[PDB]
Amino acid sequence: GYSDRARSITLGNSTITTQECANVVVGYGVWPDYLKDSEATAEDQPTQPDVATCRFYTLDSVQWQKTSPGWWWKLPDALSNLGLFGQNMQYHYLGRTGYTVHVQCNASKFHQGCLLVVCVPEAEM
Amino acid sequence: GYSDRARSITLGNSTITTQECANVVVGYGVWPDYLKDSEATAEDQPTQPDVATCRFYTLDSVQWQKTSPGWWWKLPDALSNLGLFGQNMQYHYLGRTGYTVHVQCNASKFHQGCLLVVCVPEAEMGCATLDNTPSSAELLGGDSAKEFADKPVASGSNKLVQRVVYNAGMGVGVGNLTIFPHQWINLRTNNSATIVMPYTNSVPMDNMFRHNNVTLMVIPFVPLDYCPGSTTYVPITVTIAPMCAEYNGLRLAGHQ
Amino acid sequence: GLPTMNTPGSCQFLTSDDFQSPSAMPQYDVTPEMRIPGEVKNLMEIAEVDSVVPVQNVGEKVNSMEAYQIPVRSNEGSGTQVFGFPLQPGYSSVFSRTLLGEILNYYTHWSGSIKLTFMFCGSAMATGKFLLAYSPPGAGAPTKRVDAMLGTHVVWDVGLQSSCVLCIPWISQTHYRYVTSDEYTAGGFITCWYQTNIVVPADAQSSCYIMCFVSACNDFSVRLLKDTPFISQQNFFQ
Amino acid sequence: GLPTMNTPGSCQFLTSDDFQSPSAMPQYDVTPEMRIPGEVKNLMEIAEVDSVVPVQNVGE
Amino acid sequence: GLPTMNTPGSCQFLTSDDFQSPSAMPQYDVTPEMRIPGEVKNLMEIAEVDSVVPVQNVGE
Amino acid sequence: GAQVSTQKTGAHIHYTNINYYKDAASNSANRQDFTQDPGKFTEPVKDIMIKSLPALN
Amino acid sequence: GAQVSTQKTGAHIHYTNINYYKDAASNSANRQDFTQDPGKFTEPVKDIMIKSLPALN
Amino acid sequence: GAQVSTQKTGAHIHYTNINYYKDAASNSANRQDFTQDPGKFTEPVKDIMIKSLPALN
Amino acid sequence: RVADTVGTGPTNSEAIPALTAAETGHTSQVVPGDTMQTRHVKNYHSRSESTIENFLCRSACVYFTEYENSGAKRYAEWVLTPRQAAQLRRKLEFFTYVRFDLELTFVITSTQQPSTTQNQDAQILTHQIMYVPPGGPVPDKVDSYVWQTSTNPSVFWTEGNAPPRMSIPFLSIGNAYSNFYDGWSEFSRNGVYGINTLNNMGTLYARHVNAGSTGPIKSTIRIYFKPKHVKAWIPRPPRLCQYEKAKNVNFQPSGVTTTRQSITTMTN
Amino acid sequence: RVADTVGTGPTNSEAIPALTAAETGHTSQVVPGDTMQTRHVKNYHSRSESTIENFLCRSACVYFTEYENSGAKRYAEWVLTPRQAAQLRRKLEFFTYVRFDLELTFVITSTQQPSTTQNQDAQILTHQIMYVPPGGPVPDKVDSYVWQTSTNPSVFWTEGNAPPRMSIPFLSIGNAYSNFYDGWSEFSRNGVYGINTLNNMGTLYARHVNAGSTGPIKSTIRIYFKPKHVKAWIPRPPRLCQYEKAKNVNFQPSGVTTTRQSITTMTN
Amino acid sequence: RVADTVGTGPTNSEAIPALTAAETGHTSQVVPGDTMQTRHVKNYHSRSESTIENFLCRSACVYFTEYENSGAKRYAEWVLTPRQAAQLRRKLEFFTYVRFDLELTFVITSTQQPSTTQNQDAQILTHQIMYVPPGGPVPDKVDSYVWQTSTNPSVFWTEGNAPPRMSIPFLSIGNAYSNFYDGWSEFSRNGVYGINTLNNMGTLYARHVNAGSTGPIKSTIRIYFKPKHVKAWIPRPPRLCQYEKAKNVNFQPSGVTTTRQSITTMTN
Ligand SMILES: CCCCCCCCCCCCCCCC(=O)O
Ligand SMILES: CCCCCCCCCCCCCCCC(=O)O
Ligand SMILES: CCCCCCCCCCCCCCCC(=O)O
């Protein structure tokens, strides 16, 4: 049999494994797909890098202290300088993409705490 | 429903229970059985003691310390003095048997370590003096376990075994011992290790005193550790069950 | 007399030849066969079995059981490296003495994918996350987790199942590689990094060990049988 | 023993001969073939291609 | 001339070999066979017969 | 009683063989016996282990 | 399993061959393979050029 | 007129032989003639002796 | 033929092919399309050189020894034993038990010895090699009666042609040749320990049939084994250490492997 | 069989078979019956000697080297490489990539060296040739253990009979043998440049098994290659210049061709 | 194939397989399952090496003799008789009468003799062997006319190649070769007694056809017999004693066997 805690995610040449995880949250009920012809506007032919751009990029780690207010990341800017994703978004004028965010924090059975992870669309500050 | 960790083994009048165990290792894919007629050589009728010989015999325990090179046991010799198995192998000339080895070590969630359990067929060992071959008192110690060494044994004019551990006494690389049937006891996961070895040999039967078919080696690849306040005495127990044991060539008692 | 003609290559002793010869013992009854467990029919049934890798072959560590241990403790930082070695399954000291390496030495060419299994051997209270990585050649070796994240990597989450697998695939320009050192057929680099940290409670050891096992996948193959450069002798043994 | 007779021309090395010889590497797996442009099957496929002629080969 | 190749083990005299050789006396009429009691076809027809054992082989 | 078999050729022709001696111990080596079964060593466990399943459940 | 083929004779007879070794790399050279295709080199253009036609029209 | 016979092989393949000389005294030795009859020597008595019976009755 | 890679795509599931448990003594059967995206590849490689018959069926020199046409050492003797040469010994010891036919080839070569004797005009030398199974008489001298070979197999070879070669069947009272033996000869658990206990293979003798010349000549014979029709059981780890004697498994302790500079160094 | 001429007659048309345009990189396929009147000829000539298999399948000496039965140079070594002899090298370099089996033939011949040693009466010499693939041990001396050839292919040859000959299969990690390589070994675009980068073929060693005599003897071995089952791709122009080294394509600039007296002279 | 043991159980009956009477000159045909309990065993052993053809068909040296290229002993003669070598004689005498074809093989080897003659440069030696059936002329000298072999079988052999070998059919005026004869040649019961009476086999002569050199050379010829298509009758006990002459059965009295210490000692 299998459990709901264990879950592996494969993308490109990257595999993420977890043995203690909650159910995956899929957006607003929608799975990221490609732009259709009855919804497009730009006439020329687009380029899909696929494996070179759709893979797991890890960022720097931050330390969780006993007095940490919290952190945030502007998703498109965060990867603007990583691999071929940044290069394709640097040589082109228009782009379109969805995301898969995995946040990881491990501690023992004698630690306590609770972190809220939220993907906020159009967070104007 | 049931889990894969729990497993009970019944043999004779002995039952072994475990609640945290890995899958059982069955030899080279073969389950121990009896000798067939198209494969026999000795003409007379053999005697099968069954329940009296095929049961779980427990040996002495050894202590796992923070600096233990490892232990080994010559399987046939280890039980040559226990119950009716020893008596039948003492009154007969030829014998044939497989084994079921269960090694047990329990510790808490705050202990760490890893032990390799390997059943090595025909583990011929070497001597510390290139000139001679080792003694029988050095190779096989009955009613006890034989300890490895962390440093090479000195040479000279003796008959000592080269008990260096990273050479396994056999003059090989120890990390390759996973070519034989094996099982790891990891204190954070495993609790015990079961191995069901069949009869391996190049003849249909053999004398059980002057030849040792297999050998049980227990080596702690990762040392034992804990923090001050937890239990410091951690033993290791070995239980061997003969399987499909038969004997041929009744004679007077003795081994000469 | 049937007229014949001898061609170049007669009365020569090629050690790898296949002929028929008269028997010295004619009409000899051979001992019947019996059933012995563990019959081998190919050398790739042996190389396909795990064996422990001596990653810490540094200094005197080769003369103990410490060569097989990879030390991993609690670090007051993040993204530092655990180990690294090149994908040279028969030439590098990390791999030349394992079952796979030993079998590879008797041959000149190899091909196929590689399995690296890692077992975590801490306490049941220790938790961690690691980032195993393989980088094909063309650049150097990665020197930070931002350079190793860009290759073929797995993120190993430590808990319950204490064993993860990193499969190194076949990414070559040729069908085969060389078992000896050759730049034209360079393999790449294998590294491991801290993903988050090893976290433990009080009264528990903050220093653990990892172990590595190497084996071959179903696509593995070898060619050109040769002599092994390991065994040697000065005079006939007695 | 099948009675035979050797004829003139035995144990000689004619460089343009066509025989069979024992293999030094028995049961060796040869690398598979791939498709390469421009396979040649005759030398007259090359001579049938133009090439520039040095007619003014006079002096320097 | 059928092209051949000699292999290791030619012009050697293995005492336990089994070949054919030219006859020195060609077309020789061999004496006919007669029936003689006690034809042996195996050495184990002889070993299967009793014989007295010298158990008291002590001294003179 | 000639035996015709296939030759070892590349991927992507036959040969003939006759036995001359009455001892089977004089025949040529059995080079083409490509049969492998690694299951005796790689997976010798009593219970089957599905690859895409938790080894311990 | 003998192979009978035709001999190289003049214009304006057969021979027999048997393979003795199980390695295809021991056979005789492939002398009679008279197949030519000069079109890869003499005329490698995209558009066909009729001989009795102006090359440039 | 080749003679195909069976080879001497173990328990638990054929060979071919041709005669080249017109004298039968040149053929190979008759190695495979496994026929035994020990009754001429072991039990040469006039009256049959049943094994499980008193020899003298 | 090796397996062919299956092309896979992106996954998001509760399946865990990577996560396993190595304490069960079981090797993970994970393919590369389990931890990444792959393409369909048609593999054509063969495992035809890894077969035990191909790995072991090659001639190897197991011994060589000398004798002379005059003087003291007039013949040569050698108890048959392959554990004198390191290469074939280390190849066989990969397994615990083996069972094969044998192909013997002998390379006999003579040399003229330095001396002051004059008018030397040598005739062709003929050599005799004789096998004595355990139990038969032995040649105490060079011109003894034992060289009549009434029953003992023997080969007469005249210098100048193809090397002598014979076929030996699997000669063993047991069901397989034991490469290792963990026990003694006597029931008293003392005496000969190890594989020397099962080494009852016979003896090989060699001599010159004629002296050839009036000057000295030394002939060396090299013996070559070649296993055929091989069967093998219970694979073992490789030796690693260097061999010391031919009768036992004695060794000198050696390090696991050779070293490098650090745990992060990509250089030997 | 070559094409047969078609008989033609007088023409007066707007067809232009002679007029073409050579700037298209296309060779004109004009037959003689396009610019003149011809007769019907039945051609019977064959193109059976222009085939690559017939053009390349001929034995050629690619190297020869010497060794002695005494003294310093007791054995000979040679990294296998055909680019030492000019003839076969220039034949192969007609194409960019080739793929063939090989037929090796060895001509070993001995000579007696001048010396003052007396009473020389030599026995037949036996030679050993040994192939070591890249990675295996090498014979540091003449009587070393490596000559046991447990796995390494080797040939024993006694002087006086047919030359030794073997068959080698297409040994390459790639799909074809590259006659030219425009690149380096290192990704840093420095180091070894050219085809020496792909020359990983092994080494060949040769020695005397016995010394034979008490006087000096020098044996020379000549190696002969013979490609079989040839495939070739991408024909190149011929060398024209004279070769200089075996590892690179270096040359000394030479004139296009040899000269004559004027543009109208019909004499060399 | 040997018989297969039948499994038996416990018995209590008036049958008596063990009790017999050996005064009847009959061997008891008791199997082990008659005096104990047994198991069923499938026997696969063969009696294929105990056959008389396999026991006797092996070449054996029956004689060797010398001759020279100069001097007195210029040729060699030998009345054919196998009773000079002990091994084959003792094998045949197992039976009273035999009947077989023969395979003859000759090992001729030359040696240079010590002498003070100089400038010796020998040419290849050719030997002649000639068989004279009883009644024909004999070679009183080396260059006599009898060596023309108009009807007498003979073999010419040049030193350096395969040993000469021929096939002889069963030559006997009787129906079988008698290994023993209890009688005389004359009806007067005096004269030649024993098997020498039936030894009318012919004579074998050997010589050098050319002298080869100007120095001395001694050639030794060794004769090898090999029975084929063997028939045998009336087995006899083995010799036990040591042979003394070739023409009779004379012996020196010897003890039944070798001794031990007591009737209870388990040691030689
Ligand atoms: C005339 C010469 C005949 C020689 C006959 C030799 C017969 C004996 C062969 C010995 C083979 C020993 C094989 C040992 C195998 C092992 O135990 O590893
Ligand atoms: C006992 C001697 C055996 C010798 C085996 C020789 C095997 C190696 C052959 C080398 C062939 C090199 C072909 C080069 C072709 C090219 O690149 O142009
Ligand atoms: C050119 C040489 C020819 C030689 C021909 C030899 C023929 C005579 C053979 C004699 C065989 C004697 C057999 C005796 C058997 C016996 O009585 O035991």
Length of chain F: 57
What pairs with residue I206 in β-bridges? I76, I129
With an 8 Å Cβ cutoff, are D24 and C14 in contact? yes
Q: What is the DSSP string of B99-149?
A: EEEEEE----TT-EEEEEEEEEET----BSSTTS---HHHH--TTS-EE-B
Q: Is there a contact between C73 and C187 (Cβ–Cβ < 8 Å)?
A: no
* Distance separating alpha carbons of residues J165 and J208, to the nearest angstrom: 18
In 10 A of CB G19, how many CB atoms?
Answer: 22
- Residue-level length of chain K: 268
Q: Cα–Cα–Cα angle for I226, I230, I236, nearest 5°?
A: 105
CB C225 within 8 A of CB I54: yes
Separation CA F14–CA G23 (nearest Å): 10
How many angstroms separate the CA atoms of C172 and J79, rounded? Answer: 26
Tally the domains of chain I: 1
Q: List beta partners, residue C12.
A: J157
Indicate the resolution in Å. 3.0
Residue given tokens 């007659």 in the structure block? J9
Tokens of C195: 């993903």
Compute the nearest-CA separation of C204 from chain I (Å): 23
| J with B: touching (≥3 Cβ pairs within 8 Å) | no
Q: Which residues of chain J are within 8 Å of residue I121 when distances are taken between CB atoms? A: 121
Using the Cβ of G25 and the Cβ atoms of chain D, whether some distance falls under 8 Å is answered with yes
K38 to chain B: nearest residue by CA?
B44
User: E17: nearest CA in chain D?
Assistant: D1
Written as one string, the DSSP assignment of B141-180 is -TTS-EE-BSSPPP-SSS--B--BTTTTTTTS-GGGGGGS
Distance CA(I67)–CA(J163), nearest Å, equals 29
Distance CA K156, CA K172 (A): 26
- C:D CB pairs within 8 Å: 51
Instruction: Please give the structure tokens belonging to residue G23.
Output: 């390695």
In this structure, what is the dihedral angle of CA atoms B8, B9, B15, B17, given to the nearest 10 degrees?
Answer: -30
Q: Which residues of E touch K56 (CB under 8 A)?
A: none
Euclidean distance between CA atoms B171 and B134, whole angstroms: 14
Q: Do E45 and H37 touch (CB under 8 A)?
A: yes
Look up residue K252 and give its two tokens: 């020196």
For atom 17 of ligand 2, the residue with the nearest CA is: J177
Residue tagged 């009154």 (tokens): B91
Q: Please judge whether I18 and A15 are an interchain contact, meaning their C-beta atoms are less than 8 angstroms apart.
A: yes
- Do chains C and E touch by CB distance (3+ pairs < 8 Å)? yes
User: I91: CA distance to ligand 1 center in Å?
Assistant: 17
Which of C177, C55, C38 is closest to C117 using CA atoms?
A: C55
Could you give the CA distance from residue E40 to residue E60 in angstroms, rounded to a whole number?
Answer: 36
Measure CB to CB from residue B23 to each of F39, F40, F47 and give the nearest one: F47
Q: Answer for the pair J220, J159: CB distance below 8 angstroms, yes or no.
A: no
Ligand with smallest separation from the Cα of J56: 2
Spatial CA neighbour of B183 closest among B197, B173, B198 = B197
Query: To the nearest 10°, the Cα dihedral for A86, A90, A93, A98?
Result: 10
The DSSP code sequence of I224-267 is EE-EEEEEEEEE-----SPP--SSS-------SS--BSSTT---
Centre a 10 Å sphere on the Cβ of residue H8 and count the other Cβ atoms it contains. 23
K109 and K61 in contact (C-beta within 8 Å)? no
- Report the SS3 class of residue A85: helix
User: For residue G15, which phi and psi values (nearest 5 degrees)?
Assistant: -135, 160
Query: Is A108 in contact with C129 (Cβ distance < 8 A)?
Result: no
Whether the Cβ atoms of residue H14 and residue F19 lie closer than 8 Å to each other: yes
What token pair was written down for B1? Answer: 């429903």
Interface of E with D (CB under 8 A): 1, 3-4, 19-21
If one counts every other C-beta atom within 10 angstroms of the C-beta of residue I5, the result is 21
Tally Cβ neighbours within 10 Å of residue G9.
Answer: 6
Q: What does each C-alpha distance from I142 to I49, I113, I124, K163 come to in angstroms?
A: 46, 20, 19, 22
Strand partners, C14: J155
Chain J residues in contact with G25 by the CB 8 A cut-off are: 101, 167-170, 228-229
Closest CA to B90 of B98, B100, B81: B81
Which residue type, as a one-letter code, is found at position J93?
E
The ligand whose atoms approach the alpha carbon of J203 most closely is: 2
Which residues have C-beta within 8 Å of that of residue J215, sequence separation ≥ 6? J112, J113, J115, J117, J120, J122
Radius of gyration of chain C (CA): 24
Interatomic CA distance for residues G9 and I35, integer angstroms: 63
**Contacts for I235 with CB less than 8 Å, ≥ 6 apart:** B179, C38, C40, C45, C46, F41, I94, I95, I96
Of B28, B170, B180, the CB nearest to I249: B170
Name the burial class of residue B215, with classes exposed (0-12), middle (13-18) and buried (19+) by CB atoms within 10 angstroms of its CB.
buried
> Helix and strand tally (H, E) in chain D?
0, 1
| Chain G residue closest in CA terms to J233 | G40
Please, which residues 1-57 of chain F have a Cβ atom closer than 8 Å to chain G? 2, 4-5, 7-10, 13-16, 31-32
CA distance B24 to B26: 6
Structure tokens at F6: 């296939």
Name chain F's partners: 3 or more CB pairs within 8 A. A, B, C, D, G, H, I
Pocket around ligand 1 at a 6 A CB cut-off: C 24; I 80, 82, 92, 98, 102, 104, 129, 131, 153-155, 166, 168, 171, 177, 179, 201
Query: Is residue B80 a contact partner of residue B192, using CB atoms and an 8 Å limit?
Result: no
Nearest ligand to the CA atom of K204: 3
Pairing mode, strands K165-168 and K95-112 = antiparallel
User: How many C-beta neighbours within 10 Å does residue I124 have?
Assistant: 18
Instruction: For chain C, give the number of residues.
Output: 238
Q: What is the experimental method?
A: cryo-EM
Which residues are E3's β-sheet partners? C5
Number of folded domains that form chain C? 1
Provide residues with CB under 6 Å of ligand 2: D 24; J 80, 82, 92, 98, 102, 104, 129, 131, 153-155, 166, 168, 171, 177, 179, 201
The distance of Cα H19 from the centroid of its chain, to the nearest Å, equals 22
Which chain A residue's Cα is nearest to I36? A13
Q: How far is the CA of I168 from the centre of ligand 1 (A)?
A: 7
Q: Report the DSSP beta bridge partners of residue B17.
A: B8
Q: Which residues pair with F14 in a beta bridge?
A: F6
Using DSSP, state whether I28 is helix, strand or coil: coil
Interface of I with A in 29-48 (CB under 8 A): 35-37
Please give the structure tokens belonging to residue H38.
């020990």
Q: How far is CA B178 from CA A23, B32, B190, C51, K24, in A?
A: 39, 21, 17, 6, 67
Percent of residues in chain D assigned helix, strand, coil, to nearest 5: 5, 10, 85
Q: Which residues on chain I place their C-beta less than 8 Å from a C-beta of chain K?
A: 119-124, 126, 145, 147-151, 156, 158, 160-161, 209-214
**Residues belonging to chain H:** 57
Residue identified by tokens 């050379």 is K217
Which residue is listed with tokens 């039968």?
H24
Do the Cβ atoms of I38 and I6 come closer than 8 Å? Answer: yes
SS3 F44: coil
Cβ distance of G24 and F9 shorter than 8 Å: yes
Determine contact, residues J257/D57, Cβ cutoff 8 Å.
yes
Query: Which residues on neighbouring strands pair with residue I227, listed in sequence order?
Result: I102
Using CA atoms in the order J66, J72, J77, J82, what is the torsion angle rounded to 10 degrees?
-40
What letters, b where the CB count within 10 A reaches 16 and e where it falls short, cover I174-196? ebbbbbbbbbbbeeebeebbbbb
Is residue A105 packed enough to be buried (19+ CB in 10 Å), middle (13-18) or exposed (0-12)?
middle
Q: Closest Cα to residue I268, out of K146, C97, K208, K143?
A: C97
Backbone angles phi, psi at A101, to 5 degrees: -100, 125
Ligand nearest to the CA of J82: 2
Alpha helices in A19-125 (DSSP H): 75-78, 83-91
Cα–Cα distance, D22 to J153 (Å, whole number): 12
Q: Which residues pair with K130 in a beta bridge?
A: K154, K205
How many CB atoms are located within 10 Å of the residue A26 CB?
Answer: 11
Task: Report the candidate in J48, A90, B69, C83 with the shortest Cα–Cα distance to residue G8.
Answer: J48
Contacts of H among chains (3+ CB pairs under 8 A) = C, D, E, F, K
Mutation to test the H interface, candidates C30, C34, C35, most H Cβ within 10 Å: C30
K154 lines ligand 3 (CB under 6 A): yes
> Do E4 and K201 meet the contact criterion of CB atoms below 8 Å apart?
no
Is residue B35 within 8 A of residue B206, CB to CB? The reply is no
Closest CA to C32 of K4, H11, I171: H11
Nearest in space to I111 (alpha carbons), one of I209, I205, I216, I223:
I216
CA distance C164 to C169: 16
The residue ranges of DSSP E strands in F7-56, in sequence order, are: 14-17
Record: contact E7-C17, CB cut-off 8 A:
yes
Closest-lying ligand 3 atom to the alpha carbon of residue K104: 4
CA-based end-to-end distance of chain D: 74
DSSP labels, chain J: ----PPP-----SS--SS---GGGS------GGGSS------------SSSHHHHH-S-EEEEEEEEESSSS--EEEEE--STTSHHHHHHHTTEEEEEEEEEEEEEEEEEEPP-------PPPPEEEEEEE-TTS---SSSS-GGGG-SSS-EEEEETTSSPPEEEE----SSSSEES---SBSSTTS-S-BSGGGG----EEEEEESS--SSS-EEEEEEEEE-EEEEEEEEE-----SPP--SSS-------SS--BSSTT----
Name the residue range of residue I79's domain.
Answer: 1-268
* Contacts with K14 (C-beta within 8 Å, 6 or more apart), sequence order: none
Cβ distance of F33 and I34 shorter than 8 Å: no
8 Å CB contact between D27 and G35 = no
* Secondary structure letter of residue A98 according to DSSP: -
Contact status, residue B148 vs residue B175, Cβ threshold 8 Å: no
Q: Which of I127, I198, I201 to mutate to test the pocket of ligand 1 (most atoms within 8 A of CB)?
A: I201
Q: Whose CA is nearest to atom 1 of ligand 3?
A: K154
Query: From the CA of C21, how many Å to the nearest CA of chain K?
Result: 17
Q: What are phi and psi of K111, to 5 degrees?
A: -140, 145
Of the residues K48, K49, K165, the best mutation for testing chain H's interface (the one with the most H CB atoms within 10 Å of its CB) is K48
Using DSSP, state whether B35 is helix, strand or coil: coil
Contact E42 K171 (CB under 8 A): no
The length of chain J is: 268
> What percentage of chain B's residues is helix, strand, coil (to nearest 5)?
10, 35, 55
Best mutation target, C74, C75, C127, to test chain A (most A CBs within 10 A): C127
DSSP state letter for K245: -
**What is the distance between the alpha carbons of residues B31 and C209, in angstroms, rounded to a whole number?**
35
Give the whole-angstrom CA distance, residue D50 versus residue J111: 52
CB pairs under 8 A between A and C: 72
Nearest to C213 by CA among B195, A17, I20, I35: I20
Do residue I13 and residue A8 have CB atoms under 8 angstroms apart? yes
Domains in chain B: ranges and CATH: 7-250 (2.60.120.20)
Neighbours of chain K (3+ CB pairs under 8 A): B, C, E, H, I
